[PDB]
Amino acid sequence: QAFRKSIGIKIKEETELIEGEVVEIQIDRSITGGHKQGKLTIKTTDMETIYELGNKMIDGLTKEKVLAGDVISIDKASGKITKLGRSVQCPEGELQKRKTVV
Amino acid sequence: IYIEANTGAVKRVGRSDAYATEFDLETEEYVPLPKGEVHKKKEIVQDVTLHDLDVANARPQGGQDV
Amino acid sequence: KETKEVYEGEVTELTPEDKTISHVIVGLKSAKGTKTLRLDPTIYESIQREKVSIGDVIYIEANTGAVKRVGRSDAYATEFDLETEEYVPLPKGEVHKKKEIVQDVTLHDLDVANARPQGGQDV
Amino acid sequence: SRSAKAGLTFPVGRVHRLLRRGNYAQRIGSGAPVYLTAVLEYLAAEILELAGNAARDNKKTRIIPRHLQLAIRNDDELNKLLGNVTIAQGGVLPNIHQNLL
Amino acid sequence: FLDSALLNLMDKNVIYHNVYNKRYFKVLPLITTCSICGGYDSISSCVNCGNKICSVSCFKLHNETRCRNR
Amino acid sequence: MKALVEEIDKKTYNPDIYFTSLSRPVKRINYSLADLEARLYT
Amino acid sequence: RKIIDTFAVLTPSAVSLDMRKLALGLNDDSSVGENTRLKVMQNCFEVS
Ligand SMILES: [Zn+2]
Ligand SMILES: [Zn+2]
What we know:
This is part of a larger assembly, with one copy of chain A, two copies of chain B, one copy of chain D, two copies of chain E and one copy of chain G.
Chain A: H1 2-5, E1 13-28, E2 37-43, E3 48-53, H2 55-63, E4 70-75, E5 81-86, E6 96-101
Antiparallel strand pairs in A: 1-2, 1-4, 1-6, 2-3, 4-5
Chain B: E1 2-3, E2 10-11, E3 15-16, E4 30-31, H1 50-58
Parallel strand pairs in B: 3-4
Antiparallel strand pairs in B: 1-2
Chain G: H1 2-7, H2 20-24, H3 36-46
Bound molecules: zinc ion (ZN) (2 copies).
PDB class: nuclear protein
Keywords: Chromatin, Remodeller, ATPase, Histone, nuclear protein
Entry title: Chromatin remodeller-nucleosome complex at 4.5 A resolution.
């Protein structure tokens, strides 16, 4: 077990990340049926667009409290939300960027 | 989806490409439709040791049900 | 040093929200205030374990999730002449309370807390 | 003039002389007509840009009083500022009630 | 020639209204791309118009000419 | 982490409809007559 | 119940929350499926 503990393995892959300031959040559900339909606006220095959300985006968006002033950073493959800062946040750069994780 | 007849295991590939324009952002990736027929067959020359059949005869390994 | 939230009050309604996956809004009637709160199904399961009903004083901790029942409130003491459930008065103060503790705990106690599960109220 | 060195358009001497001969007080300061031309220049620029975009909405290169009427009445601060002001040849707003439909 | 009565009404219906497909509106999968360079890796509809914009230069070129509702 | 306890109103809160929100800024108002009459007559 | 109610005082003052869910493998993300945690949490929810 110690001889297997001594040697390690490095494995790398690439993931996408969208980081940008939220303008407003407009979800849509029903009082009896369900089937939530989320819409919010993501903004940065040189991009400002409205993103429509799915079921799991409102699942992670309602299990974790967030505001219009609060700013998110979403990974597409992981599906979890990083509520980083509110209006720390002071962001720059492009909206959707791809970085490698090792 | 991906469904095996003899084993019963179920794997999902994702939402089809026809529903990619329903929402602008979705955590579910959009995969194309699988080419070919519905029913497919193939033969494998897979080798497996007799002790592996003995552990397969000894204790339950694991399944997708409770 | 850490702060924890303290909730207490008389149970008014145990009902789902309006539609459901089975959560329960617990309306805790305190003396100086009346507030309704939504709880997890595990702490609601311990609420079902404590056999509480409409008009029972409970004690609920926010961060930990432990549930203690104090007893039936003093308003329902005249409902029956003899009852095994003792009658406790209404808790004074607000619904939400906060305090800070200077509790000391050894690092080995944190190691046993990191090693094996100790206990809980669920199955 | 002192309007160009201070970034102004309206003259300071006409407003200062108008405050002198307007019977307001005995002593008049030097920064008060500059402040007044600043406020009147910002407000007049606001009505010029709102009536300019209101003229840009109806695809006309000239400002009719209906564009100024809709530009003033469509803004909340201009309607709260001037609520009794009647504009000639400006018309009214297309306000249609829901229960009459 | 279309205003003339030399052609029948059923002739105009068969020539113009009957050749187009009636039942099948969409069979193939629908694809939404960006309106500037067609980037499908970034599907992001705009604010004032709701137009799909992929990259940052596509938005900076989008605010000037192709945005009418702004 | 995730809070097991959530304070909530009876009348204002609904479990289904969830909503969260926060020189001179001015909302864009269309001055077109056919746009407003087109909106009010549909 | 009286001896238990009178003689049980001490508490395990140090604990880690959300370790009880992970020790059995039933959480929001694990190698087990979706209704294993639901049917196990329901059969647990009925058995006292
Ligand atoms: Zn593009
Ligand atoms: Zn736009």
